[model samples]
Target: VDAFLGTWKLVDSKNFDDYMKSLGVGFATRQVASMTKPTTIIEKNGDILTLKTHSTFKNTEISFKLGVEFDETTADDRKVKSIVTLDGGKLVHLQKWDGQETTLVRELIDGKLILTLTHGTAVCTRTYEKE
Candidate 1:
């Protein structure tokens, strides 16, 4: 968890088409999203953590403690409550939002931190490494 305690810039992303489709974002919006720079910042102190996702286009921030339920809004603006817990060596996020539920499990693999976001029929995965 402490490994996430810094600002992370979006280096690369994929599965944008599927994400936009689920969000009802138009093709034009998708194009904009692809080009938009995004940032994720995490601050941890003891058991409390504050996570912020920001971009030139949009921004969101969330606060929570490990294993406690907390609310969040996606970069695209889907509001959800989530819980973080350790599952094996990975940190897992289970979320409930807007009548749509999802789970995101993240782990550091190789030189990259991998995050898998899953909801119903849509699954989006991304990876980032420390700068």
Candidate 2:
């Protein structure tokens, strides 16, 4: 958990627009989200965690505890049940929305944070460098 406690700036993204589309994001929001770079900050307090994603167009924040499930409203406005867990060296988030599931994995490698998002069949990988 300490390995992920820092501010990371978005450096690269692959298939992000398609991932947003799969989440039912509107056209205008998708356009804005695709073009905007985001900064991710992860703060940990014992078993409590807060993850915040900041961008010019929109910002999202989620707070939860390890191994606990909570209700979350995604950036695309989907209401879902979200649970976060640690798998090996990675932080994994499992979300269920409208009978659909999405997984997000965050791992740190060589001072960089790699985030992989999978929604339905669409996969998006985003890398963020520590700042």
Candidate 3:
């Protein structure tokens, strides 16, 4: 977590439309979301962490403890249960809403942060550069 503690700039994103489509998000919402290149910030306080994302389209934040279950209202406006845990050097985030589930894997490699989100057959990979 220490290496990922600072502000990061979005470098690239791919296949996010299909990922959002798996969540049944509206076409307009997905369009606006695809247009955003958000800044991400990760901050820590003891065992808890705050993840914040900022964009011209929207700003979102989440506070969570390493292995605790919590309710979250997602950026896509879906109510879900979520849990985050660190595995090896990767941050694994799981979200469940209704009967659907999504996994978000975050890791750093070769000076770049890579985030991959998957739901069903849809997957989106986004890359970030540390600031």
Candidate 4:
């Protein structure tokens, strides 16, 4: 769990636009997101887990207990329900809103955090290095 708790800098992303499109984000918002590389901070206080993303467009944070559902406002300003759970050695994150859902899987691969985002038929891969 300690490996997943740290300050992480986003290094690379692939097919992010398609992923955003699948999430029903508009052109302007997607362009804004494409311009910035966000930093993520993972921390814990008691039983609450916090995941915060720092970005030029907007900063977003979510705190929730594992395996519990909670409301969230996404970076793109979507109001959704989010749930995070540990499965195997990875983090399984799910967000659903307006009858659509997205899945994000997080794992430390070779000491770097690897994230895979999926929505509909679109998939994006993001790599984050601990910093």
Best candidate (score: TM-score): 3
Candidate 4 residue spans exceeding 4 A from truth: none
Candidate 3 backbone collisions, by pair: none
Stretches of candidate 2 exceeding 4 Å from the true structure: none
Compute each candidate's TM-score over C-alphas: 0.82, 0.96, 0.96, 0.95
Ranking by lDDT: 3, 4, 2, 1
- lDDT against the true structure, per candidate, is 0.74, 0.91, 0.92, 0.91
Model 2, span 5-36: residue lDDT tens: 98999999999988988888889888778888
lDDT: worst 10-residue window of model 3? 1-10
The candidate that wins on lDDT is 3
**Every model: Cα RMSD to truth:** 2.1, 0.9, 0.9, 1.0
Q: Candidate 3 on 1-131: residue-level lDDT in tens?
A: 78879899998999999999988999999989888899999999998899999999888899999899999998878899999998998999999988889999999999899999999999999999998
Q: What is the lDDT of residue 51 in candidate 2?
A: 95
- Tally clashes: model 3: 0
CA lDDT of 75 in candidate 1? Answer: 66
For the record, the alpha-carbon RMSD of candidate 1 to the native fold, in angstroms, is: 2.1
